[PDB]
Design a binder for this molecule. Structure first.
Ligand SMILES: COc1cc(CNC(=O)CCCCCNc2c3c(nc4cc(Cl)ccc24)C[C@H]2C=C(C)C[C@@H]3C2)ccc1O
Ligand SMILES: COc1cc(CNC(=O)CCCCCNc2c3c(nc4cc(Cl)ccc24)C[C@H]2C=C(C)C[C@@H]3C2)ccc1O
Ligand SMILES: *[C@@H]1O[C@H](CO)[C@@H](O)[C@H](O)[C@H]1NC(C)=O
Ligand SMILES: *[C@@H]1O[C@H](CO)[C@@H](O)[C@H](O)[C@H]1NC(C)=O
Ligand SMILES: *[C@@H]1O[C@H](CO)[C@@H](O)[C@H](O)[C@H]1NC(C)=O
Ligand SMILES: [Cl-]
Ligand SMILES: [Cl-]
Lengths: 532, 532
């Protein structure tokens, strides 16, 4: 009854799940397209054909095929991001958490997982929607989408591997929500899409793309934006990386059809095993198969679209973490270790700069080095470590997002900007990594409300604050409740550029979120690289 | 007797002058070259032909022909630098102060005035040698040299106007000191040359030039160095400026001989009136007629001589003032005034950057602007004013000197570096100009010892503090007296790069003088300009 819902594609049967001291309804693993298997690998997706009978939606679905991290086997801090279900190309499913009793037409939030467009799962423990759905009385959806070559192999001109099909994956999920969430008590006119990392870039890409704009109301972007240097490639570079994938696998390279046909004959893991080999440079924070600027999903360049106001005009809430770079340095740069303070020698600093700005010429590398080096104290291993951390975070996350924020706000209908800088009391990663890429998510999804996870009382309060900000924004376009006695998160405006810190302390309002280095990253360095 | 001295060129009669509550001997206006007049204009100097009878050396000589500042008529702060004697091309004379009674063979210090190679006089009140000669028991010489076109018009390949003849004037005076100072109680083997601004650059040029090296023992450079961007031009640029001078005066331009013949017919003021017109850019801290890198006075480029160690190996003492740029902004840049705090708008800041780095392309100007702009507070008129002040001082004085210091110290036999940052209590210039280009000179020459000039007692001590450093360095190659236990001025070394502040407070040792900005000026910007 409460758990039996007839959708436009067929009947589904959910399950009743405990949440804190109560219960809510969960519909897990609902299919929203045809399995993209066999001759449909790399292809645009197709809607799921209606089914007879009742779809058992009591269990999480498979995860999409992806690279699996084995750097720290068994370590909870890294394994919490790996697939926790069987991987399969049959992975295009969504999950829904619905308050009990079912509401009539309440606000909908659709989570888009990140993972650099190469990884991610809707089923991770940290994305369990039940705490946010129960606490804030929202219908919480998490979608899925093909990652890696399966979602973003791009041979422009081919209709068999056109590129961006993972983005199209997200779109079909949003269209399914548009068509069916009313049967779960959700309001299809009040859908907020939100995501972190590539999910945040994705949210911004749907703001940009005409084919996506009418499928949601407003948007939240966490540590990601559509213009990030890692988040897209040209059609030429996408073509080069697809051909190099075939070269790594002894494919016929004479035509797209023969290349695609060879690649479609490979087992999924054969593609994954050579995925990182197609990158052009030794690099960190760079991923092989990402969205392409194609002229279809993206009509023109992202920058021209941002400049002209060619995007959805609505409210946005977005922000970054204090130490976005540390995860990438730990996994990919010399001198960093999970088990030490990772003081960085001058030599390893210079190596890290090269890995962090792989596209830069030697003059550009000199510019980055001078901007982030204290020449009164150039052998200070802690300053070198933190300087490289800032380089990676500023170049890859913060400065692209601030460029996006400033362009969007010229045309949009309300911007709210945050700086998340709380290090969790129970973090398993070392202190030099600070406030890590991905580690605001557990606060957004309410994990500190679970006493067994051993968060502090202040962290539970912070999680409750953030969930209420996110959900009140989703409901109203404004994270603040009116007539409330709590300090107000101010609008970000072109003139005053205000933002708040998010942490356990009373709110602080600041202005011009890191403005100096982003002048460097957004105006000076691109001009230097374009001149030289 | 004490005032009657037989030199190798003839007899001279000096005069007994009061100094504080005592007396010393002064020999003023001794000729060291033939008057460079008529056909001799622009020509290398020729030794003064010996005279019969007694040369009357009781009176200051004429000053060389030069541009005279009329910006602030009658204002003591600027008038103190103007010629205080009649100007004449018959101006190649030197002055000597000798302790009374005459010493046997004491240390000699030879002052070389500055003035951007376009101005300067040996006879200014602030260069009165009597306090230094009396207080420190040295023989103090001040020389003179042709400035402007008269000293530095350069038509390379012509022997009639070869360039660098003002430097050859200095050398001829040093040769005269070498040959004659023993008759005044000076030791020709212990001569220190010292100078400020262009005089400091000149001192460095004599260190470089093979034809000068044997005419002095060691060297002091104040707020100037041979590699300063204003201190030399190429033979091609000197030729362009000489031809343009002729163009301004309707000269025949078909040949060097015809051009020179024309310029020699003009009255001196006719040349001076158009002198600034030959500069290639709207600019500040750039001067028309300066030393040329000719392959004769300078055998190769300054940088290659410095890299190869092709220079005199001895001890040097040198330094800079806190606010070298302020004078040039007051006189040449928009928004500055003697009668206001000169808060600088953003627009006037950008204009000032362009005037300050006239040779830079737009990418270069962007780099300078980013390096000196606080983008959290870019409309702060005090920060804009002080940022421009630092740009002018760093680019033109401090960083070129630090480059020289660094290169010299690899091969030299002892470097002592200072940072003079005391603002005089009785300064007539406004507070925003800080510690001004030229305003350490009055301390070096002992003017705070004169009660009627109204320095504080701490400023008298500092002046005594500086005169003793300078004269002890001249005597021994080390500014510190041994077995004294005043705090010691450490050697500047390649590794530790120590320097001292010079001010009324107890001496503090620091390291790496303006190292951050000088990486920009000495390494990154030249690379950027070369590559773009
Ligand atoms: C040098 O060799 C390689 C090095 C690497 C480096 N990168 C990888 O292996 C991907 C590793 C995934 C790690 C798990 N995912 C994480 C994720 C996030 N944060 C993490 C923070 C820490 Cl401290 C650790 C892991 C995080 C946040 C999210 C964003 C991404 C890109 C992946 C996932 C979600 C890949 C391939 C190589 O061959
Ligand atoms: C009007 O625009 C122009 C502006 C100028 C610059 N004009 C000048 O006369 C330069 C200023 C003359 C006074 C120079 N004397 C000074 C000198 C020094 N310091 C000074 C500090 C202050 Cl605050 C004021 C004057 C100083 C230190 C020394 C260095 C120089 C170059 C000149 C002389 C000695 C020239 C031509 C122009 O057309
Ligand atoms: C030297 O010149 C001074 C000043 O003109 C004069 O007072 C003095 O008598 C002269 N000495 C002579 C002519 O012996
Ligand atoms: C200067 O040279 C002497 C003798 O050649 C040497 O003993 C001394 O160490 C040198 N000093 C410096 C500072 O180079
Ligand atoms: C110096 O001080 C004396 C006495 O205090 C005063 O008469 C004189 O005007 C002062 N000089 C200047 C130049 O201000
Ligand atoms: Cl100041
Ligand atoms: Cl050394």
């Amino acid at each position: 009854s409460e758990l039996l819902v007839n959708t436009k594609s067929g009947k589904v049967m959910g399950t009743r799940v405990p949440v804190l001291s109560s219960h809510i309804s969960a519909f897990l693993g609902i299919p929203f397209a045809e399995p993209p298997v066999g001759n449909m690998r790399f292809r645009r997706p197709e809607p799921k054909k209606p089914w007879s009978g009742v779809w058992n939606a009591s269990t999480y679905p498979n995860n999409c095929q992806q690279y699996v991290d084995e750097q720290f086997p068994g370590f909870s801090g890294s394994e919490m991001w790996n697939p926790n279900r069987e991987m399969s190309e049959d992975c295009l499913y969504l999950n829904i958490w619905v308050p009990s009793p079912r509401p009539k037409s309440t606000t909908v939030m659709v989570w888009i997982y990140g993972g650099g467009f190469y990884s991610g799962s809707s089923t991770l423990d940290v994305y369990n929607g039940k705490y946010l759905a129960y606490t804030e009385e929202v219908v919480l959806v998490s979608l899925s989408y093909r990652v890696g070559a399966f979602g973003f192999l791009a041979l422009h001109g081919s209709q068999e591997a056109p590129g961006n099909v993972g983005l199209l994956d997200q779109r079909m999920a949003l269209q399914w929500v548009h068509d069916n969430i009313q049967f779960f008590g959700g309001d299809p006119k009040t859908v907020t899409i939100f995501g972190e990392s590539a999910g945040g870039a994705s949210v911004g890409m749907h703001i940009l793309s005409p084919g996506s704009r009418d499928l949601f109301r407003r948007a939240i972007l966490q540590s990601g934006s559509p213009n990030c240097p890692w988040a897209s490639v040209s059609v030429a570079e996408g073509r080069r990386r697809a051909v190099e994938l075939g070269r790594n696998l002894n494919c016929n390279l004479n035509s797209d059809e023969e290349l695609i046909h060879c690649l479609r004959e490979k087992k999924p893991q054969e593609l994954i095993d050579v995925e990182w080999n197609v990158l052009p440079f030794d690099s960190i924070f760079r991923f092989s198969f990402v969205p392409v600027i194609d002229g279809e999903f993206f009509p023109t360049s992202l920058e021209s679209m941002l400049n002209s106001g060619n995007f959805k005009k609505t409210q946005i809430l977005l922000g970054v973490n204090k130490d976005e770079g540390s995860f990438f340095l730990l996994y990919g740069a010399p001198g960093f270790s999970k088990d030490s303070e990772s003081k960085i020698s001058r030599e390893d600093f210079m190596s890290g700069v090269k890995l962090s700005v792989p596209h830069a010429n030697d003059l550009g590398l000199d510019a980055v080095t001078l901007q982030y080096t204290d020449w009164m104290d150039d052998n200070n291993g802690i300053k070198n470590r933190d300087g490289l951390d800032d380089i990676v975070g500023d170049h890859n996350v913060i400065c692209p997002l601030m460029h996006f924020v400033n362009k969007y706000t010229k045309f949009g209908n309300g911007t709210y900007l945050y700086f998340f800088n709380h290090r969790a009391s129970n973090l398993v990663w070392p202190e030099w990594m600070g406030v890590i890429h991905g580690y605001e998510i557990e606060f957004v999804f309410g994990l500190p409300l679970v006493k067994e996870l051993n968060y502090t009382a202040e962290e539970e309060a912070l999680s409750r604050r953030i969930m209420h900000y996110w959900a009140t924004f989703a409901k109203t376009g404004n994270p603040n409740e009116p007539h409330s006695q709590e300090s107000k998160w101010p609008l970000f405006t072109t003139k005053e550029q205000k933002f708040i810190d998010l942490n356990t302390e009373p709110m602080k309002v600041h202005q011009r979120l890191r403005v100096q280095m982003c002048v460097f990253w957004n105006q000076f360095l691109p001009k230097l690289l374009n001149a030289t």
